[PDB]
Design a protein around this motif. Structure first.
Motif, short mmCIF file in Angstrom:
data_model
loop_
_atom_site.label_atom_id
_atom_site.label_comp_id
_atom_site.label_asym_id
_atom_site.label_seq_id
_atom_site.Cartn_x
_atom_site.Cartn_y
_atom_site.Cartn_z
N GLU A 85 0.83 -1.21 0.00
CA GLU A 85 0.00 0.00 0.00
C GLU A 85 0.86 1.25 0.00
O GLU A 85 0.40 2.33 -0.36
N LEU A 86 2.09 1.09 0.44
CA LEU A 86 3.08 2.13 0.32
C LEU A 86 4.26 1.45 -0.32
O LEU A 86 4.58 0.31 0.03
N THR A 87 4.89 2.12 -1.28
CA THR A 87 5.99 1.55 -2.03
C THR A 87 7.30 1.74 -1.24
O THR A 87 7.94 0.75 -0.86
N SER A 88 7.67 3.00 -0.98
CA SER A 88 8.86 3.31 -0.20
C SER A 88 8.71 4.65 0.51
O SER A 88 8.34 5.66 -0.12
N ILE A 89 8.99 4.66 1.81
CA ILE A 89 8.96 5.91 2.57
C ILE A 89 10.24 6.16 3.35
O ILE A 89 10.91 5.23 3.75
N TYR A 90 10.53 7.43 3.59
CA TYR A 90 11.73 7.85 4.30
C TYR A 90 11.47 8.46 5.68
O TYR A 90 12.39 8.53 6.51
N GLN A 91 10.23 8.91 5.94
CA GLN A 91 9.94 9.72 7.13
C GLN A 91 8.46 9.71 7.51
O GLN A 91 7.60 10.05 6.69
N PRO A 92 8.15 9.31 8.76
CA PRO A 92 6.77 9.46 9.25
C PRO A 92 6.64 10.67 10.16
O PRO A 92 7.56 10.96 10.95
N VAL A 93 5.53 11.41 10.04
CA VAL A 93 5.28 12.55 10.90
C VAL A 93 3.86 12.54 11.43
O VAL A 93 2.91 12.35 10.68
N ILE A 94 3.73 12.77 12.73
CA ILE A 94 2.44 12.84 13.40
C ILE A 94 2.14 14.30 13.74
O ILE A 94 2.92 14.96 14.43
N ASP A 95 0.99 14.76 13.22
CA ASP A 95 0.50 16.11 13.44
C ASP A 95 -0.27 16.27 14.76
O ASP A 95 -0.36 15.33 15.58
N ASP A 96 -0.85 17.46 14.92
CA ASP A 96 -1.60 17.87 16.09
C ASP A 96 -2.94 17.11 16.25
O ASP A 96 -3.49 17.03 17.36
N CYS A 97 -3.44 16.56 15.14
CA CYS A 97 -4.71 15.82 15.12
C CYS A 97 -4.54 14.29 15.17
O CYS A 97 -5.50 13.55 14.92
N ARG A 98 -3.31 13.83 15.49
CA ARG A 98 -2.95 12.40 15.48
C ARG A 98 -3.19 11.74 14.14
O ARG A 98 -3.65 10.59 14.06
N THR A 152 13.67 10.83 -4.55
CA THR A 152 14.58 10.05 -3.74
C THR A 152 15.38 10.90 -2.73
O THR A 152 15.94 10.38 -1.77
N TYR A 153 15.38 12.21 -2.92
CA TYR A 153 16.13 13.11 -2.04
C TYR A 153 15.24 13.96 -1.13
O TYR A 153 15.62 15.05 -0.72
N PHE A 154 14.06 13.44 -0.82
CA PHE A 154 13.16 14.08 0.13
C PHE A 154 13.64 13.82 1.54
O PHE A 154 13.95 12.68 1.89
N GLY A 155 13.74 14.87 2.34
CA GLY A 155 14.20 14.74 3.71
C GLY A 155 13.04 14.94 4.66
O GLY A 155 11.95 14.44 4.43
N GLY A 156 13.27 15.72 5.71
CA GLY A 156 12.22 15.95 6.68
C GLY A 156 11.06 16.72 6.07
O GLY A 156 11.22 17.44 5.06
N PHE A 157 9.89 16.58 6.69
CA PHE A 157 8.78 17.47 6.39
C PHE A 157 8.03 17.91 7.64
O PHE A 157 8.21 17.35 8.73
N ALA A 158 7.18 18.92 7.47
CA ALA A 158 6.33 19.43 8.54
C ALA A 158 4.90 19.53 8.07
O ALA A 158 4.62 19.87 6.91
N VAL A 159 4.00 19.21 8.99
CA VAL A 159 2.58 19.30 8.76
C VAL A 159 2.05 20.51 9.50
O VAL A 159 2.12 20.57 10.73
N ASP A 160 1.51 21.47 8.75
CA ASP A 160 1.02 22.72 9.30
C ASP A 160 -0.48 22.67 9.34
O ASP A 160 -1.14 22.80 8.31
N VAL A 161 -1.03 22.44 10.53
CA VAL A 161 -2.49 22.39 10.70
C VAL A 161 -3.02 23.73 11.23
O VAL A 161 -2.86 24.04 12.42
N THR A 171 -4.60 22.62 6.06
CA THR A 171 -3.38 21.93 6.41
C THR A 171 -2.37 22.08 5.29
O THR A 171 -2.70 21.85 4.11
N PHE A 172 -1.16 22.48 5.65
CA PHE A 172 -0.08 22.59 4.69
C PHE A 172 1.05 21.63 5.02
O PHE A 172 1.36 21.38 6.19
N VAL A 173 1.65 21.08 3.97
CA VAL A 173 2.78 20.19 4.13
C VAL A 173 3.99 20.74 3.36
O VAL A 173 3.92 20.98 2.15
N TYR A 174 5.08 20.96 4.10
CA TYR A 174 6.34 21.41 3.52
C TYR A 174 7.36 20.27 3.56
O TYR A 174 7.76 19.84 4.64
#
Ligand SMILES: NCCc1c[nH]c2ccc(O)cc12
Length: 380
Positions: A85-98, A152-161, A171-174
């Motif tokens: 269901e997901l092919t390949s991921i580099y980073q999981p992030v949990i926002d303010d809404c879980r 392939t060169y995606f690093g960290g991200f932030a979820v802006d709720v 909600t914005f994702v950078y």
């Protein structure tokens, strides 16, 4: 200064036929802890062949802090059936809404050896709702082909709720990209995205990394993004840093949410020599930013209220000779400070770097106050 946490020589999976994958090829690059659910999520990108689950979970209820349970087995994500269901991921992030956010980059990074089992597709931002069981998919956005720029060169991200107490849709994702020195910006409300580049997102001097008595080197752009206190309109500083750099910038989310607008990043400005970090995390409760560093074997801190950012205004919250290549850091729901190393820097053949101690190391300091006590990051 005390820590509890996990250590693995190899990332082994629960309920996967032994021998049907090489445990040294399972390389985790990131985590996210859900404090309410007592759940740990680990990113294991499909960089090498035969990764059974790219999003893996462990139940920390039994294990965390319990002597003898330092290396839990990895499980399939509870919101998944097969692992495709997901092919390949580099980073999981949990926002303010879980909501659990991952960035499926959309293809695997090796050829043959079962690569057909994971057919390619366009990069996707995907989100699962940890509040509902068992973690249903609530966001699935595909990148328009016009915007793909080396996923392939995606690093960290932030979820802006913007509306954490409403339906959480504003909600914005950078998402950082450390090759292109680029931020990919996703507007969840409009279902629109665009890329933005700035000379500020680029590497300074190459980062020096010691392995096996030798000095290696990498050159990474932005890596590298965390969100501060909102004002009454819902805008905040977004702190960022390049991997190969000692400078730290902030840019307002106001300028970020405006497609085609000019950016005005503020220098803050630097952490002192050889302290390159690829991950940083802002804590709302202390106002401190924590850096998981590349070569220094340390986790560092800077109170955002002490200006300007010079080395004299930073301190060390963690030291371990075995913390080789800090790769992720976040603060959890109950104010837990988590930080991870995996001896896997962005250098050719780093997957085959081997250590006399467990390569994958994940630690929590119970709270951020415990961390910064008696340090220049305190108050006072
Ligand atoms: N340690 C793995 C290096 C790495 C490559 N891409 C990444 C993205 C996020 C991260 O924490 C780390 C990485």
């Amino acid at each position: 200064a005390d820590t509890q946490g996990y250590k693995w020589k190899q990332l082994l999976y629960n309920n996967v036929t032994p021998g049907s994958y090489n445990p040294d090829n399972m390389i985790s690059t990131a985590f996210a802890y859900d404090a309410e659910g007592e759940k740990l999520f680990l990113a294991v990108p499909r960089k090498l062949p035969r990764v059974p689950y790219t999003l893996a979970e462990v139940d920390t209820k039994n294990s965390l802090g319990v002597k003898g349970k330092h290396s839990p087995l990895l499980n399939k994500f509870s919101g998944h059936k097969t692992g495709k269901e997901l092919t390949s991921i580099y980073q999981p992030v949990i926002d303010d809404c879980r909501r659990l956010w991952v960035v499926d980059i959309g293809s695997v990074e090796y050829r043959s050896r079962g690569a057909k089992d994971y057919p390619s597709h366009r990069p996707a931002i995907v989100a699962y709702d940890l509040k509902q069981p068992n973690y249903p998919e609530v966001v699935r956005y595909y990148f328009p082909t016009r915007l793909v720029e080396k996923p392939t060169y995606f690093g960290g991200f932030a979820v802006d709720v913007a509306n954490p107490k409403g339906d959480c849709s504003e909600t914005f994702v950078y998402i950082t990209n450390f090759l292109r020195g680029a931020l990919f910006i996703y507007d969840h409300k409009k279902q629109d995205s665009w890329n933005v580049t700035h000379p500020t997102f680029k590497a300074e001097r190459p980062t020096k990394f010691d392995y096996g008595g030798k000095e290696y080197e990498f050159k990474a752009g932005i890596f590298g993004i965390t969100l501060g206190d909102r004002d009454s309109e819902g805008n905040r500083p977004a702190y960022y840093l390049a991997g190969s750099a000692i400078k730290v910038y902030s840019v307002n989310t106001k300028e970020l949410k405006q497609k085609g607008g000019k950016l005005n990043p503020e220098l803050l400005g630097n952490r002192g020599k050889y302290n390159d970090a690829i991950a940083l995390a802002y804590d709302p409760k202390t106002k401190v930013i924590f850096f998981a560093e590349a070569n220094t074997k340390q986790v560092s801190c800077w109170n955002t209220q002490k200006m300007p950012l010079r080395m004299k205004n930073t301190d060390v919250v963690y030291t371990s000779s075995r913390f080789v290549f800090g790769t992720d850091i976040s603060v959890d729901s109950k104010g837990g400070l988590w930080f991870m190393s995996n001896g896997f820097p962005p250098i050719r053949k780093s997957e085959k770097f081997k250590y006399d101690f467990p390569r994958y190391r994940l630690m929590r300091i119970m709270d951020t106050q415990e961390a910064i006590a008696g340090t220049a990051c305190d108050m006072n």
